[PDB]
A paper describes a structure:
Cthe_2751_is a 15.8 kDa singleton from an anaerobic, hyperthermophile Clostridium thermocellum, with an unknown function. Therefore, based on primary sequence analysis, Cthe_2751 is a non-Pfam singleton with an unknown function. Each monomer is made up of 8 α-helices arranged in a spiral pattern around a vertical axis that runs through the centre of the protein. The structure reveals an all α-helical topology similar to those observed for nucleic acid processing proteins.
Cthe_2751 crystallized as a dimer in 3 different crystal forms. Superimposition of the dimers crystallized in different space groups revealed no obvious differences in the position of the Cα atoms suggesting an identical mode of dimerization in all the 3 crystal forms. To find out if there is a difference in the packing arrangement of the dimers in the 3 crystal forms and to quantify it, a computer program was compiled and a calculation was performed to analyze the inter-dimer distances of 2 neighbouring dimers for all 3 space groups. As expected, the inter-dimer distance between 2 closest dimers in space groups C2221 and P4122 is relatively similar when compared to that of the distance between dimers of space groups P212121 and C2221 or P212121 and P4122, where there is almost no recognizable co-relationship. This result further supports the inferences of crystal packing analysis where we saw that the dimers rotate less than 3° along the C axes during the transformation from P4122 to C2221 resulting in only a minor change in crystal packing. A mathematical calculation performed on the dimers of Cthe_2751 crystallized in different space groups corroborated the findings of the crystal packing analysis of molecules packed in different space groups.
Residue numbers in the entry:
A (entry chain B), B (entry chain A): 2 to 129
Write the structure that this text describes.
């Protein structure tokens, strides 16, 4: 329950950031998904401090990242893909390729879809 | 020199990437600066696979990032700032603030420098 207190409570809340920046992968794992939720919108002031943390602990983040990519929250997967994919070390990069391919193949029916299809296409082109 | 064999030999050389991704901070330290040199130009194909490694070992990378920001290689410091600064965890972010401040204050005499001055400005505004 002490760990869960380290989770930001609102979009401006960096009170726990120093404590967070100190944990090892297995110390932060239990709340990694909770931290990833603060990337649903990167324009939230706290997203800029959460992002480095989750990238640094990317290896234990992966199953949760895939869940997001397999979800229906377009904005959330857009930020996750855009911000995290270029900073995934090789083995983790290969884990998410599947989702990028899938997303790049979607029919473009609105602008939100077009954004994530074109990002997926550019990222497959560049990174893989 | 077993370790140095993991430094890519040329701008397409990803032959050592799998091994690099298995090291921890203190193993990789002795070549972190050699790895940082591969960000002198992020269009080099190997750069995209080195960036995840250097960010992941950012804590032993900081004195060497400072050295790069204190050098006179424009493009190198453009990429290092642009690519690494958003992904520094709080305490490493703090260490580099000084160099950003200094760079945003440079008189723009050689116009090639503008991108560094203005990037530092933008990043001071956004991340701090």
């Amino acid at each position: 329950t002490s760990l869960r207190d380290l989770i930001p409570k609102h979009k401006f809340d960096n009170s726990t950031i120093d404590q967070l920046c100190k944990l090892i992968d297995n110390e932060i794992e239990p709340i990694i998904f909770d931290l990833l939720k603060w990337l649903q919108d990167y324009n939230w002031p706290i997203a800029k401090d959460i992002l480095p943390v989750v990238v640094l602990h990317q290896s234990i983040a992966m199953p949760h990242i895939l869940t997001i990519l397999q979800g229906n929250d377009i904005m959330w997967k857009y930020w996750v893909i855009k911000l995290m994919i270029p900073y995934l070390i090789y083995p983790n990069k290969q884990l998410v390729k599947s989702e990028l391919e899938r997303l790049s193949s979607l029919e473009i029916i609105n602008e939100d879809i077009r954004e994530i299809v074109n990002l997926s296409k550019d990222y497959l082109h560049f990174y893989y």
